[PDB]
Amino acid sequence: VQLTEKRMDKVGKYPKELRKCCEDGMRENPMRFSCQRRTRFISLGEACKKVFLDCCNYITELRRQHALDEDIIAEENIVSRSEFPESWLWNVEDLKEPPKNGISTKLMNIFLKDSITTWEILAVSMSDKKGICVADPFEVTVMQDFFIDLRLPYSVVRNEQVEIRAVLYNYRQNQELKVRVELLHNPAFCSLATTKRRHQQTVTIPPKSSLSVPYVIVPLKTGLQEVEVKAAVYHHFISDGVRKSLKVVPEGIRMNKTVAVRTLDPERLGREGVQKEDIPPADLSDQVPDTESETRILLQGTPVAQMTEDAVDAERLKHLIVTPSGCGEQNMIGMTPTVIAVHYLDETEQWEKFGLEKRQGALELIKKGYTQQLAFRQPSSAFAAFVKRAPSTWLTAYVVKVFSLAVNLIAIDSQVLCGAVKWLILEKQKPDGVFQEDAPVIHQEMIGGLRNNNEKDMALTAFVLISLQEAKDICEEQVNSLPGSITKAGDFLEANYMNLQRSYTVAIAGYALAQMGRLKGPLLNKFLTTAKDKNRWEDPGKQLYNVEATSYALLALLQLKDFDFVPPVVRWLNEQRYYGGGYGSTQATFMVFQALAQYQKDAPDHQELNLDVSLQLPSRSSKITHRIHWESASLLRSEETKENEGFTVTAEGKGQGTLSVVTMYHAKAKDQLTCNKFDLKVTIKPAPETEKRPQDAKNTMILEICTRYRGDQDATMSILDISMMTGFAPDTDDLKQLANGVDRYISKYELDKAFSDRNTLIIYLDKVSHSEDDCLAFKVHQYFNVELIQPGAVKVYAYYNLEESCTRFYHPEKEDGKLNKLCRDELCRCAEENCFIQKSDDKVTLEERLDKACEPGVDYVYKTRLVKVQLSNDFDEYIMAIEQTIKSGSDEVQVGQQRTFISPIKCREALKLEEKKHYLMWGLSSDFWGEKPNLSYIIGKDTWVEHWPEEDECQDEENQKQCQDLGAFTESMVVFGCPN
Amino acid sequence: SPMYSIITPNILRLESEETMVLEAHDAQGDVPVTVTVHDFPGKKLVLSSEKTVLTPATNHMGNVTFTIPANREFKSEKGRNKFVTVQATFGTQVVEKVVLVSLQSGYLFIQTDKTIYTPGSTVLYRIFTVNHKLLPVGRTVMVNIENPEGIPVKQDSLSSQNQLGVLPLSWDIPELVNMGQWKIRAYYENSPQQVFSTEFEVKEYVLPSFEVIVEPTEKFYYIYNEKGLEVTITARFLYGKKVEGTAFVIFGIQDGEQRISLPESLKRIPIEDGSGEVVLSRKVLLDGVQNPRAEDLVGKSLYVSATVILHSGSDMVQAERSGIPIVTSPYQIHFTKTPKYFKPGMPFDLMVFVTNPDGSPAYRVPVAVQGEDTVQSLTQGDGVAKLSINTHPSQKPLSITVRTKKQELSEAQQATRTMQALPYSTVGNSNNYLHLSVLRTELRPGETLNVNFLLRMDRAHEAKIRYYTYLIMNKGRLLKAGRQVREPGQDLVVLPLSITTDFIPSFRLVAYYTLIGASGQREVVADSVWVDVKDSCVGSLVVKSGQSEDRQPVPGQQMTLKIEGDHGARVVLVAVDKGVFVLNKKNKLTQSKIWDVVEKADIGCTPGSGKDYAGVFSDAGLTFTSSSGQQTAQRAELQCPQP
Amino acid sequence: QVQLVETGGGLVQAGGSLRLSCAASGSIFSLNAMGWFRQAPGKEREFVATINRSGGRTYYADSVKGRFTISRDNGKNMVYLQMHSLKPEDTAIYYCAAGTGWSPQTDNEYNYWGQGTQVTVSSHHH
Ligand SMILES: *[C@@H]1O[C@H](CO)[C@@H](O[C@@H]2O[C@H](CO)[C@@H](O[C@@H]3O[C@H](CO[C@@H]4O[C@H](CO)[C@@H](O)[C@H](O)[C@@H]4O)[C@@H](O)[C@H](O[C@@H]4O[C@H](CO)[C@@H](O)[C@H](O)[C@@H]4O)[C@@H]3O)[C@H](O)[C@H]2NC(C)=O)[C@H](O)[C@H]1NC(C)=O
Ligand SMILES: *[C@@H]1O[C@H](CO)[C@@H](O)[C@H](O)[C@H]1NC(C)=O
């Protein structure tokens, strides 16, 4: 009863075609949906559905028996290994010494690589007399019999109890190795090794095998720290050692919240004199305690200076956008912005001052983009958003547009472009002039209204017309029906133009009609009227779509050569930068780039750059006067300050630019207060032990994510951005089952690690239904067991409208208290020293209290009373009450006011507080902290905390000695001052 | 009587030195000859006069070596073979022949460091630019890298004029790109119609916890062996620790490029100590139901798919063993190296090629001919064994049957093969044949080969033969040409052929004599031979260790590397892992691949004879024409007619 | 790789002393084990002394436990063997050997050897 051979034996009785559906039906679905609920998600298999149900029902009732058992499918036609060691010794040398019997000899001394593998050097000779000669491989078996491997996680969050392990490999066959393995000490984390003594231990490795030696460390400081293990063998002369770098990340999540963005322009705005502009400080009502914050002030001399400078540099082009790129339109970062950037620089003749050498680099970037984009192509030149999906009309037309715009820069194959135009015109355009879309919706303007969907055809047809407006003389001999398609599309747009209710449709349709010269009269009036405040085309509830609509409308205005309605639209488009200096989605950044770039077609009485921007920063001691001029290599200047303040900026002179004020801080792990346009629930539940896990894994758990759209229709494109907990990684088997099976629930996964905090897992969803919850679950494996784990984040957001989001956090929440790594040793007292002062082992006198209290840093000395205790899984909050200010600090506080002290979780057991007990506490002016509620004293290495026994219990033996000392302390700190 | 003979390569390669040998028979005075080549049609000249005179001091042998400059004309862009007309004027008598042209301009070989990559790695590739003589030359070549959709994503265009025929190139695979059999195309800027390609797979990034090797004990399957196919399942971790687990293995039959998975052979064997043996019995094997017999399954192949699951984890790795042959005999007899025509009466040499089921050459395999099976001939290292038969002079089409007689075998496992050979055609039924015989050895440059000339003819006009005309065909070009004297009354005439490094890798010898025939007409008796030299380097290069067997070097050690090459030659190196060099299918870059490519572009199609008197020159890759009216049938086929 | 040349031997008094210098022809760093071996006529190849790559760890055979002292100067690429309190039974051919670092007391893990030098310790009279 192996029940695997039964499964495969039953699979072997279906036709070879349409045979995968029974295989995927036999699979254990991790999101344990019944057969009839999985047959709802199967796409194209009509006979497959019945087959999927037949086999699913089968194996499911064969699983109802037998409570070692093997229940995995044995598949076929899959190659196993890749990632072989990188090649080296790639050089061209020649022989030019006198030959010996016609054979020249040259000796070349080389350095072997640090890899344990069998290299095989291949040689080829080319002689201009005796021709060519391919040599035999010279096999070099590089081997080492004692090799030490250090296993540490990807990143560890501060104050976590992780157990790294040093695996020792012994390949000696006749010898059982006795070796002394030692962990070196680093003051940046509490290890079993200190400065007082080493942590060296003697172990014995069996022959032809390994041994794992564990070390538990507690990171105390954020940054890249050195984990170094030394191994010295106890018999031979082999001494090996490993020194790896472990990065320790802060306790929250990184945020680059945009403080404000202000258009720097003294001529059209700022009236008399010149423009003054106040910039507020940041919110930071949730900044993680004891974390730094950096404010980057960015001065763009022109509206499109940073976007170009980033579009040229390779290792900076992907910083324009805060969302991943794993789909047909998203990948277009590799082309579009670099394309319009190079064109903007060509039209304005700026490569001379900027640097000619970079142009070709940009072109190579475009080449790479083009290469990447070719991966989404189907037969007959049709582009789908994801492989194994129906080709989309919108994406195909958009790729046509970008490619036809790119034929000027790099070599674009006319077969793909022309075949795509042919696919669009011939297959997707109906004699109605309407373009059909038989794929899932990508843009939320592609789905339109329901009972009347007239505008649904309007927006798509206008977009495809904009696409074909730039492939006029580029692709025509292959597809000669471009004037007729433009005719029919423009006719459908110009006929049903008075049926448009949304401002986006009006915008993009107006630009499509203006490109042909058909925007005039009632269409012109109707178009310009909808613009609210005559500087933005917007709809409530769709935020980035308003940036797109304003961009398309600006292109319509520049197409009509109208130079009156533009400056307000430029001022509005320049101040929509919400996610860093750039924008959220791809389409927003692209269209704003195109429009703001094409406002500088020529210089027809247009503003030339010569600004005199002075900034009075409170953190700095003097004014800061930046002067960016035209005909300068860098139209960009930036400064950085490590203190968050609200500074005043004063622009002057002639020139229109941008002031981007962005900060960087770490927010706490609290779930979203108000989730705008998304419902999201995340739960994590442990998996059974007997259920098999990978070998290196220690514990396996199930992660379940359930989301729902709150809109009137289904969401069009959604991202699940899951940041893993420390030491965790997803099970790629389940991800493969969900992304590639017949019952599809995931478009594709990524695991796109950008080297920021913990590694992320991006999941792509074609849609999120509003009629139900799109639950999906998968296994997560903990390869390093961690205690005091800080929770992980799961942020959902719509790709083309980032304000539709919901950020939730998940945690196992183990029961009633904290299980840490065994605290008996000094490894623990070391960790607990960090978060509150240390007492001399009950040898505490009031004279000592006076010393430590009369330190020059001691700003406040309070007598608190523990009112409330709200402890979380990342930071415990003690809502205290001041009963008497024995020494008030730099912050005014009244007797009886509450102050909420924050403490790290790792210190909870070290403090062991009880509610409604008196306490003596003191600290520094640095202990005060900026949050709201304005109750922020961080209990740190300088915060004295001691339980004050009440008057009724001073009649006990262990208390009176402390009571009298505390009273003498109080009066000796009120009546008598400090002499130090 | 005056007879001006012209023979030149049957297919003229462009930008290559083609030697033309023109003669003057029965004429004792010296005739001036200037040869020119014209575009067909038209009077467009692409070669100068190329002067020479044929003085009796050189026995009337001429040299007019020339190169054909590459130009576009006569529909080299519309699917026609742009023929050219050669002119050979002997005083006033002019002999012309329309010769086929092949725009080839040389060879391009592509070196890839790996064959399976990861999306994100670097591809180090080099282009080698040589001509038809495999010497480095400076040409302009276009290098395009194509995705499996056939879209060039990386276009380059460079000249290897002063880089000594090598072009180092690199490309970084992006993180998201197509998956499949990516190609690298390389073609000459002058001859884009000729493309060379090397393929590689990008696939994806996978790192298994353990490797599983699944292979049978026998490198083939003998059908009548009821022991079954015994397959070994070994599995070990990637660091030398044997895997403990269990393997689900299944068998099936690969007919052509399709398969029939057998759901009756699925077995679960325990993999203990990294070892596991499973057998596919002939009982279950015969039970595949289509038509049940054991001789219809010959020619198909088997395949073994194994899925090993680890005991201590959920890890699972599968491997497949394909390319295993189902043979009726563990040896194969091939007449592909044996001529397809025989001369009646005079003995026939058979170049019987003995090989193994995997295509490898056989060694020490006794073979014999049916009928006169009382002969003893063993196979050499190259895999060729000669079997001579003394045939009778008749009009019979000779049907030969050869079988191997290797004992210590059941002699049902001995294969037999039947070839059909058509007779020769003498002009005028003159019974005039010449036979060239050589002793089959694996010879090297530096040796001297005795070429046995045989001449059988009637007693009349036997004193008219004082000279054999011998020409050497090497890599498509004419290497050496000359005369071999003969005293009348001799039946065997030995030619001392001095073999140098130029005869590599294979050469065809053409020998003919012309005379006034007994039927009254012009008689041209001819015969050729395909002689295979050991396929080794024209030069020499090896790479060995340094001072004193640097034993199992440790990572980071500075080991001395000794390079042994030719004087005045660039040497390119690339250190790749064994794990990628081993699994690259047959896409390696070896010397044998180079020689196989050069021999694949050979003009001659038949080993050593022709259908008639002029078919010998055509089958040898030569156009023969005369002033007396003897010529070959012109070819319009750039590729040989495949049988 | 590296080859070695031993010098400093010869004939010496019964209880005298002499230092044997082992010259290397390459890089002596990264050589974990550097060992002196002796072979007397009518004796198996026996072990004398080994020194670590940086010194500190020294292994000696019981026959020369306190009488001999092996040293090394990595800067000069030299290994020294000082022989104090000689005994007539020490008459042998002393070799210098480059090793791997594995099991230095045995002679199987030394892939490079030298030429050797004859040390003859003559007894009193006889
Ligand atoms: C979130 O927001 C943060 C804001 O901090 C982003 O992080 C920053 O990204 C910036 C670029 O996007 C980084 O800008 C760089 O600034 C460097 C300056 O650093 C020092 O400057 C002082 C000034 O005297 C020097 O002495 C020091 O030696 C350093 O240089 C520049 O060096 C760097 O590159 C240069 O820029 C200049 C012009 O600005 C060029 O002329 C020069 O050729 C070179 O290109 C660059 O400008 C900034 O450091 C960086 N902060 C950190 C520490 O990360 C995040 O990337 C945003 N994250 C996301 C995901 O959006
Ligand atoms: C012409 O050159 C070839 C090649 O070396 C040679 O075989 C031939 O003998 C030469 N011609 C004469 C007349 O010697």
Helix (H) / strand (E) containing A165:
strand A161-170
Is the CB of B58 inside a 6 Å radius of any atom of ligand 2? Answer: yes
User: Is residue A188 a contact partner of residue A221, using CB atoms and an 8 Å limit?
Assistant: yes
Whole-number Å distance between alpha carbons of A372 and A327: 10
DSSP designation for A414: H
Determine the structural domain holding residue C69 and report its residue range.
1-126
Does residue B638 form part of some domain? no
Using CA atoms, how far apart are residues B606 and B615, in angstroms rounded to an integer? Answer: 10
C108 CB near a chain B CB, below 8 Å? Answer: no
Cα of A691 to nearest chain B Cα, Å: 9
Cα dihedral B335, B338, B341, B343 sign: negative
Is the preceding peptide bond at B41 cis, omega within 30 degrees of 0?
Answer: yes
Q: Going by CA atoms, what residue is nearest to atom 55 of ligand 1? A: A256
- The Å distance, Cα A639 to ligand 1 centre, comes to 9
DSSP string for A564-575 = SSHHHHHHHHTT
If phi > 0 it is left, if psi is from -120 to 50 it is alpha, else beta; for residue A450 that is alpha
Cα–Cα distance for residue pair A754/A321, rounded to 1 Å: 13
Q: How far apart are the first and last CA of chain A?
A: 84
Judging contacts by C-beta atoms under 8 Å, the chain B residues touching residue C111 are: 548-549, 551
Looking at domain A835-980, which of 3.40.50.2300, 1.10.630.10, 3.30.1330.10, 2.40.50.120 is its CATH number?
A: 2.40.50.120
Residue A92 dihedral angles phi and psi, to the nearest 5°: -110, 105
- Please name every residue paired with B18 in a beta bridge, in sequence order, or none if there are none: B66
Give yes or no for A94 touching B (CB within 8 A).
Answer: yes
Alpha-carbon distance of A131 to B537, in angstroms, equals 9
Q: Residue B397 has which token pair?
A: 């089409």
Class of domain A251-301+608-669: mainly beta
B548 vs C1, C27, C30: nearest CB:
C1
Distance of alpha carbon A56 from alpha carbon A742, whole angstroms: 13
CB atoms within 10 A of CB B130: 21
The residue with tokens 């094997």 is B285
Q: What is the topology classification, in CATH, of domain A1-68?
A: Influenza Virus Matrix Protein; Chain A, domain 1 (1.20.91)
Look up residue B69 and give its two tokens: 């400059």
- Cis omega before residue A949 (within 30°)? no
- Do B594 and B624 fall into the same domain? no
CATH assignment of the domain containing B295: 2.60.40.1940
A948 has which bridge partners? A918
* Rounded Cα distance, C47 and B219, in Å: 50
Write out the CATH class of domain A85-145.
Answer: mainly beta
Does residue B641 fall inside a structural domain? Answer: no
Other Cβ atoms closer than 10 A to A717: 25
DSSP A304: T
Residue at which a domain ends, from B413, B431, B449: B431
Of B207, B223, B247, which residue is a domain's last? B207
Select from C31, C59, C79, C102 the residue whose CB has the most chain A CBs within 10 Å, as the one to mutate to test that interface.
C102
CATH code of the domain in which B518 resides: 2.60.40.1930
Distances (CA, A) of A271 to A61, A265, A266, A575, A648: 79, 10, 7, 19, 17
The DSSP string of B438-496 is -------TT-EEEEEEEEE--STTSTT--EEEEEEEETTEEEEEEEEE--TT-SEEEEE
Split into its structural domains, chain B has a count of 6
Length of chain C: 126
Helices within A440-497 (DSSP H only): 454-468, 482-495
Query: Cα(first)–Cα(last) distance of chain C, in Å?
Result: 45
Q: How many CA atoms lie within 13 A of A361 on its CB side?
A: 14
Amino acid, single-letter form, for residue A659: L
Contact B559 C1 (CB under 8 A): yes
Nearest residue to A459 (alpha-carbon basis) of A422, A421, A503, A415: A503
Domain count, chain C: 1
Q: Say which DSSP state A676 is in.
A: S
Is B640 a member of any domain? no
Give the span between the Cα atoms of B637 and A351, in whole angstroms: 56
Q: What is the DSSP code (8-state) at residue A911? A: H
Nearest residue of chain A to residue C51 (CA atoms): A237
Same domain, B17 and B90: yes
Q: Provide φ and ψ at A340, rounded to 5°.
A: -65, -25
Residue A604 CB burial class (10 angstroms; 0-12, 13-18, ≥19): exposed
List CB contacts of A564: < 8 A, sequence separation 6 or more: none
Q: Which element (helix H / strand E) includes A864?
A: strand A858-871
Residues in chain A whose C lies over 2.5 Å from the next residue's N (breaks after): 67
ω into A791 cis (within 30 of 0) = no
Give the Cα-Cα-Cα angle A574, A575, A581 (nearest 5 degrees).
85
Amino acid at B297: L
**Quick check: C103 and A175 CB within 8 A?**
yes
Burial A19-46, CB ≥16 within 10 A → b, else e: ebbbbbbbbebbbebebeebbeebeebe
The whole-angstrom distance between B549's CA and the closest CA on chain C is: 8
Distances (CA, A) of C123 to C86, C89, C119: 10, 9, 13
| Residue B468 contacts residue B44 (beta carbons within 8 Å) | no
* Cα of A109 to nearest chain B Cα, Å: 5
Distance B611 CA to ligand 2 centre (A): 29
- Burial of A220-242, coded b for 16+ CB within 10 Å and e otherwise, reads bebeebebbbbbbbeebbbbbee
SS3 A622: coil
Element containing residue A677 per DSSP (H, E): none
CA distance A325 to A339: 17
Sequence-distant contacts of C51-54: CB under 8 A, at least 24 apart: C51/C79, C52/A237, C53/A237, C53/A239, C53/C29, C53/C101
- Rounded distance between C-alpha atoms, residue B531 and residue B472, angstroms: 11
B278 and B217 in a common domain: yes
Size of interface B-C (CB pairs under 8 A): 15
| B55 Cβ below 6 A of ligand 2 | no
| AA letter at A61 | E
Task: Spell out where chain C has E strands.
Answer: 4-7, 10-12, 17-24, 34-39, 46-51, 58-60, 68-73, 78-84, 92-98, 112-113, 117-121
- State whether the beta carbon of B61 lies less than 6 angstroms from ligand 2: yes
Interface membership of C11 toward B (CB under 8 Å): no
Q: What is the CATH number of the domain that holds B587?
A: 6.20.50.160
Identify the bridge partners of residue C34 per DSSP, sorted by sequence position.
C51, C98
A836 three-class SS: coil
How distant is the Cα of C26 from the closest Cα of chain B, in angstroms? 11
For every residue of B168-220, DSSP letters joined together read EEEEEPPSS---SEEEEEEEESS-TTSEEEEEEE-------SEEEEEEESSSS
Cβ burial of A951 (10 Å; 0-12, 13-18, 19+) is: exposed
Of A5, A90, A125, the CB nearest to B571: A125
Among residues 558-597 of chain A, which lie with CB inside 8 Å of chain B? none
Residues B411 and B487 in one domain: no
Is there a single domain that holds both residue B311 and residue B230? yes
Please provide the DSSP assignment of A434-453 as one string.
Answer: PBP--S--SSTTSS--SS--
Ligand 1 atom having least distance to the Cα of A637: 39
| Helix orientation angle between A566-573 and A586-598, rounded to the nearest 10 degrees | 140
Q: Can you give the C-alpha Rg of chain A in angstroms? A: 34
- A293 phi/psi in degrees, rounded to 5: -140, 135
Q: Concatenate the DSSP letters of all residues of B119-149 into one string.
A: TT-EEEEEEEEE-TTS-B---EEEEEEE-TT
Are residues B90 and B31 part of one domain?
yes
Tokens of B72: 């576009």
Work out whether the CA dihedral A281, A285, A290, A294 comes out positive or negative: negative
Q: Are strands A294-300 and A699-709 parallel, antiparallel or unpaired?
A: unpaired
B96 and B125 share one domain: no
C-alpha R_g of chain B: 29
Residue A223 bridge partners (DSSP): A248
Q: Are residues B190 and B215 in the same domain?
A: no
Cα diameter, chain B: 95
B463/B515 same-domain check: yes
Burial zone of A531 (CB within 10 Å; 0-12 exposed, 13-18 middle, 19+ buried): buried
Greatest CA separation for chain A = 109
Residue A750 to residue A761: CA distance in whole angstroms = 6
Place of tokens 């044995």: A74
CA distance B557 to chain A (A): 6
Nearest C-alpha of chain C: how many angstroms from B562?
Answer: 12
Q: Where are the domains of chain A?
A: 1-68, 85-145, 146-250, 251-301+608-669, 302-607, 670-813, 835-980
Say if C71 is an interface residue toward chain A (CB within 8 Å).
no
Segments of A274-313 assigned E as strands: 276-278, 294-300
Residue A203, classed as helix, strand or coil, is: strand
Cβ of B483 below 6 Å from ligand 2: no
The reply to whether B643 falls in a domain is no
Q: What angle do CA B315, B316, B318 make, to 5 degrees?
A: 155
Q: Is B474 in the pocket of ligand 2 (CB under 6 A)?
A: no
Distance between CA B118 and CA A977 in Å, rounded?
A: 72
State which amino acid sits at residue B87: Q
CA dihedral B157, B161, B166, B172 (to 10 degrees): -30
Ligand nearest to the CA of B481: 2
3-state secondary structure of A828: helix
Per DSSP, the three-state class of A189 is: strand
Q: What are the beta bridge partners of residue A887?
A: A861
Residue A663 CA to residue A279 CA, distance in Å, equals 12
CB contact set of C67 (below 8 Å; sequence gap of 6+)? C83, C84, C85, C86, C87
**Total residue count of chain A as it appears in this document:** 980
Helix (H) or strand (E) holding A105: strand A104-111
Supply φ then ψ for residue A345, to 5 degrees.
-65, -30
Domain boundary among B431, B449, B470: B431
Q: Do C1 and B551 touch (CB under 8 A)?
A: no
- Do A80 and B540 count as a contact with CB atoms less than 8 A apart? no
Question: The tokens of A552 are what?
Answer: 């398309």
Q: A670-813: CATH homologous superfamily? A: Alpha-macroglobulin, receptor-binding domain (2.60.40.690)
Euclidean distance between CA atoms A243 and A152, whole angstroms: 11
CATH architecture of the domain A302-607 equals Alpha/alpha barrel (1.50)
Strands A156-157 and A239-249, sheet pairing: parallel
Task: Determine the structural domain holding residue B446 and report its residue range.
Answer: 432-536
Neighbours of chain B (3+ CB pairs under 8 A): A, C
Q: Residue A8: which H helix or E strand, with range?
A: helix A5-11
- Rounded Cα–Cα distance for residues B495 and B466 (Å): 14
Closest C-alpha to A752, from B329, B176, B160, B265? B176
Cross-strand pairs, A722:
A761, A794
Two domains, one topology: A1-68 and A146-250 = no
| Whole-Å CA distances, A104 to A129, A555, B565 | 14, 70, 6
State how far the Cα of A313 lies from the Cα of A468, in Å rounded to an integer. 30
Return d(Cα A779, Cα A773) in angstroms, integer: 20
Q: Are residues B276 and B215 in the same domain?
A: yes
Q: Judge if B130 and B102 occupy the same domain.
A: no
DSSP 3-state assignment of B350?
Answer: strand
Q: What is the DSSP string of B489-518?
A: T-SEEEEEEE--TTS-SEEEEEEEEEEE-T
- Cα–Cα distances (Å) from B208 to A79, A737, B305, in that order, read 10, 18, 17
Amino acid identity of residue A638, one-letter, is S
Task: Provide the CB-side half-sphere exposure for B72 (13 A, CA).
Answer: 8
Rounded distance between C-alpha atoms, residue A699 and residue A704, angstroms: 17
Residue A769: name the closest of A864, A679, A654 by CA: A679
Mutation target among B566, B590, B598 for the A interface, most CBs of A within 10 A = B566
End-to-end CA distance of chain B: 41
Tell me, in angstroms, the distance from the centre of ligand 2 to residue B8's CA. Answer: 14
Would you say the CB of residue B482 lies under 6 angstroms from ligand 2? yes
Find how far residue A299's CA is from the centre of its chain. Answer: 25
The SS3 assignment for B248 reads strand
Q: Are residues B321 and B392 in the same domain?
A: no
Which 8-state DSSP code applies to residue A425?
I
For residue B185, report the phi and psi dihedrals to the nearest 5 degrees. Answer: -90, 140
Ligand 2 and B480: CB distance under 6 A: yes
Structure tokens at B77: 């862009």
Q: Look at residues C48, C26, C46 and name the one whose alpha carbon lies nearest to residue C35.
A: C48
CATH number of A146-250: 2.60.40.10
Q: A850-873 as b/e, with b when 16 or more CB fall inside 10 Å?
A: beebeeeebbbbbbbbbeeeeeeb
Helix (H, G, I), strand (E, B) or coil at A732: helix
| Ligand 2 centroid distance, CA of A893 (Å) | 114
Burial degree of B459 (CB within 10 A; 0-12, 13-18, 19+): exposed
Domain membership flag for residue B350: yes
Query: Chain C within 8 Å of B555 (Cβ-Cβ)?
Result: no
Distance from Cα B477 to the centre of ligand 2, integer Å: 13
Residues of A in contact with C101 (CB under 8 A): 236-238
